[PDB]
Amino acid sequence: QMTQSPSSLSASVGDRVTITCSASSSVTYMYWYQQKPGKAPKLLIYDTSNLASGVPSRFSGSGSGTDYTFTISSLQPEDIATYYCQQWSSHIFTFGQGTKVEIKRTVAAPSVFIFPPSDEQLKSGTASVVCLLNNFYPREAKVQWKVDNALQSGNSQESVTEQDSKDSTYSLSSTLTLSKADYEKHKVYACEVTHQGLSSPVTKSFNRGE
Amino acid sequence: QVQLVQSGAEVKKPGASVKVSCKASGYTFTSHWMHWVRQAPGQGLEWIGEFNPSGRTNYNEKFKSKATMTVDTSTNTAYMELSSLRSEDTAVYYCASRDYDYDGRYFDYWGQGTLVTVSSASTKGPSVFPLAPSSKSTSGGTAALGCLVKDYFPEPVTVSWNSGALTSGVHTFPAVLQSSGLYSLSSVVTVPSSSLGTQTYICNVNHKPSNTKVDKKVEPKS
């Protein structure tokens, strides 16, 4: 049975990243793939230690008996990905469980933006209100929706991007969903953002219909 | 350039069958094996099997009962067919090829993947709404704008800006599953606020399961 370790890791830019796979047998070589989010897996190392064409030099692979090692000698922002080892063994190709590689970087405060629903959506029955948190670190953030100073719950959903391949930041989108009737019933719409990079919670607001 | 182009994402009923296609361009690809790989959402990679055109097939034991691999030599298209589909078959399916060519160069090529979703629920294209730039978008000489992509099924949706000409400052968020059982996502972009009067911004939303493409112009509100 193939064992890839660790499952995830965080390191700084310029750090050495080390990933291991232990194999059932030594008679076939080990391969290493890089998978960025949304993209297909990309071969980086073949035949245990050969660099694939185009792959930068900071990537290397080695093996000794049934123990194999993949190394990024100097972690770069674009290297965030899940890495997999792969070996042919007992008439099949087996992939490792994967190693998610993340970047530790300096604190950065989110840029907050609020978007009222479009007239087109509103008049057709529903109002989606959107709060955008742009390019922040670390990942942890609190978004609170306020309607006429009343705190909302059960009626919002959010999602976060994968870490940015250039600046190692995250971005967050929060949607407040209301009926047309409930939306037109109120004036002030606000999102309150709590994040480590802000010295106090930041509010972004608009008044309906102006 | 060498490319593997796969058939678009599809919803299929439980018990039904689907046939993913993989079209090879830029290389001869007659004397190389074609691999099929699956990746369940948020999971790892599993090898399904391999097919030789020049005409044997090797299967992973787990996928012997569920998969059938074929090829069309005249069109340069490999096919993988999944029978008696259940919820556990919901996954991205990749075609891939790795070998030495005629000139002895080592290659590895992958298709873009095909998300097969297994569900009784029907496909639905998205409704697209603007996320308009305003005074509440100005932060320091730059403004944020976007597109809300609402009420589609199944995954996935891809989004570009100005047909791919606008790439920097773009964030396309992962979809949320709503209480209604329909997906919603946003895509945003930060631009100079001095561009708002003159530059045109259009989001291009693709949803292949419903065969729908939507372009939406995003303007400042009057």
Q: Which residues contact B145 (CB under 8 A, 6 or more apart)?
A: B130, B131, B132, B133, B137, B188, B189, B191, B201, B218
B94–chain A Cβ distance below 8 A for any pair: yes
Chain A closest-CA separation from residue B176 CA (Å)? 7
Q: Which residues contact B141 (CB under 8 A, 6 or more apart)?
A: B192, B193, B194
Chain B residue numbers touching A161 (CB-CB < 8 A) = 171-174
**Structural domain boundaries in chain B:** 1-116, 117-222
Among the partner-chain residues A97, A114, A121, the one whose CB lies closest to the CB of B129 is A121
Mutate to test the interface with A, among B27, B127, B142, B171 (most CBs of A within 10 A): B171
Tokens at A16, concatenated: 């050495």
Long-range CB contacts (within 8 A, 24+) of B4-7: B4/B95, B4/B96, B4/B97, B4/B109, B4/B110, B4/B111, B4/B112, B5/B111, B5/B112, B6/B93, B6/B94, B6/B95, B6/B111, B6/B112, B6/B113, B6/B114, B7/B114
Chain A closest-CA separation from residue B48 CA (Å)? 9
Of A52, A70, A105, which closes a domain? A105
**What domain count does chain A have?**
2
Side chain identity at B72, as an amino acid letter? Answer: D
Alpha carbon distance B112, B94 (integer Å): 7
Burial class (CB in 10 A: 0-12, 13-18, 19+), B120: exposed
Count of helix runs (H) and strand runs (E) in chain A: 2, 19
Chain B closest-CA separation from residue A5 CA (Å)? 14
A40–chain B Cβ distance below 8 A for any pair: yes
Interface contact flag, A159 B185, Cβ < 8 Å: yes
User: Do residue A138 and residue A208 come from a single domain?
Assistant: yes
The answer to whether the CB of A5 falls within 8 A of the CB of A20 is yes
Beta bridge partners of B80: B20, B69
Interface contact flag, B130 A173, Cβ < 8 Å: no
User: Do residue A18 and residue A72 come from a single domain?
Assistant: yes
* Ordered alpha helix ranges (H), chain B: none
Quote the DSSP letter at residue B168: T
User: Do residue A51 and residue A97 come from a single domain?
Assistant: yes
Matching CATH number, B117-222, of 2.120.10.30, 2.60.40.10, 3.60.110.10, 3.40.50.2300: 2.60.40.10
Alpha carbon distance A161, A166 (integer Å): 13
Task: For residue A119, give the CATH number of its domain.
Answer: 2.60.40.10
Strands A8-11, A99-103: pairing is parallel
Q: How was this structure determined?
A: X-ray
Which residue range is the domain that position A205 belongs to? Answer: 106-210
Residue A74, Cβ neighbours under 10 Å: how many?
15
Interface contact flag, A43 B190, Cβ < 8 Å: no
User: Do residue A73 and residue A115 come from a single domain?
Assistant: no
Chain A closest-CA separation from residue B17 CA (Å)? 24
Strands B142-152, B10-12: pairing is unpaired
Alpha carbon distance A66, A88 (integer Å): 13
Tokens at A201, concatenated: 């919670």
The answer to whether the CB of B48 falls within 8 A of the CB of B20 is no
Distance spanning both ends of chain A, measured CA to CA? 64
B160–chain A Cβ distance below 8 A for any pair: no
A198–chain B Cβ distance below 8 A for any pair: no
Q: Which candidate, A76, A103, A73, A99, places its Cα nearest to that of A86?
A: A99
Alpha carbon distance A168, B116 (integer Å): 31
